[PDB]
């Protein structure tokens, strides 16, 4: 690993600097190096890992959708270029998803014993399978979808047993699993039911929160409301 010679603390400091500089490819490479030190991640470090790769894969998903849309127009050939370049972006996206799933499998999920860490990592495993599902078309698409569902389901089971209904990790999980249902699993009723039950159970727990916890919870509850407004 290219980050093998850098101190763990220096990798984390540099991930924070890369985030301020909007250098998300650098931020992800620093956090990959921090993970490969083999120590469990703190809550802040798990968030740095997630923010870095979400930004990198975000740019790739946006580029992929632009190229896929042009390819579809262009097949409704004018040569192989649009397909070749969509494939190049798709392969790069798949490699970033593969890298993140590799970090989770070696060995973040297996050492994560607290509900906060284990749910966080299982949610990420769900998300990166879901990003793979968005571009999957072959004999693999069913198996990728099932891998997303399995990770999200284990995260949901733990979150319901171990976390209050307003826990922002639990809320962000349920948000993401509901979007999975709506547009990957073709299960809009499941998506709506999950988003509604999640919203309503959080609403009833808000009275237990400080002003700071209340802001963190209601920010994610607003995303559930925004989706329900589009879906119903």
């Amino acid at each position: 690993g290219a980050m093998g010679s850098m101190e763990r603390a220096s990798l984390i400091q540099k991930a924070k600097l890369a985030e301020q500089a909007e250098r998300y490819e650098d931020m992800a490479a620093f956090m990959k190096g921090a993970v490969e030190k083999g120590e469990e991640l703190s809550c802040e470090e798990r968030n740095l890992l997630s923010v870095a790769y979400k930004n990198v894969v975000g740019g790739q998903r946006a580029a992929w959708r632009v190229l896929s849309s042009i390819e579809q127009k262009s097949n409704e050939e004018k040569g192989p270029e649009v397909r070749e370049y969509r494939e190049k972006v798709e392969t790069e996206l798949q490699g970033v998803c593969d890298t993140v799933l590799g970090l989770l499998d070696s060995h973040l999920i297996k050492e994560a014993g607290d509900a906060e860490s284990r749910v966080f990592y299982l949610k990420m495993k769900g998300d990166y399978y879901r990003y793979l599902a968005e571009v999957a078309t072959g004999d693999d698409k069913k198996r990728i979808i099932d891998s997303a569902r399995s990770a999200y389901q284990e995260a949901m089971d733990i979150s319901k047993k171990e976390m209050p209904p307003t826990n922002p990790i639990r809320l962000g999980l349920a948000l993401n699993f509901s979007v999975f249902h709506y547009e990957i699993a073709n299960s809009p009723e499941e998506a709506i039911s999950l988003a509604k039950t999640t919203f309503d159970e959080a609403m009833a727990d808000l009275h237990t929160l400080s002003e700071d916890s209340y802001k963190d919870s209601t920010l994610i509850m607003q995303l559930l409301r925004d989706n329900l407004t589009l879906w119903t």
Binding site: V51, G59, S69, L175, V179, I220, L223
Partner: peptide, 12 residues
């Protein structure tokens, strides 16, 4: 394509 709200940075 209409991307629904998901957790964290809206980076796409």
């Amino acid at each position: 394509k209409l991307m629904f709200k998901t957790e964290g940075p809206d980076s796409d």
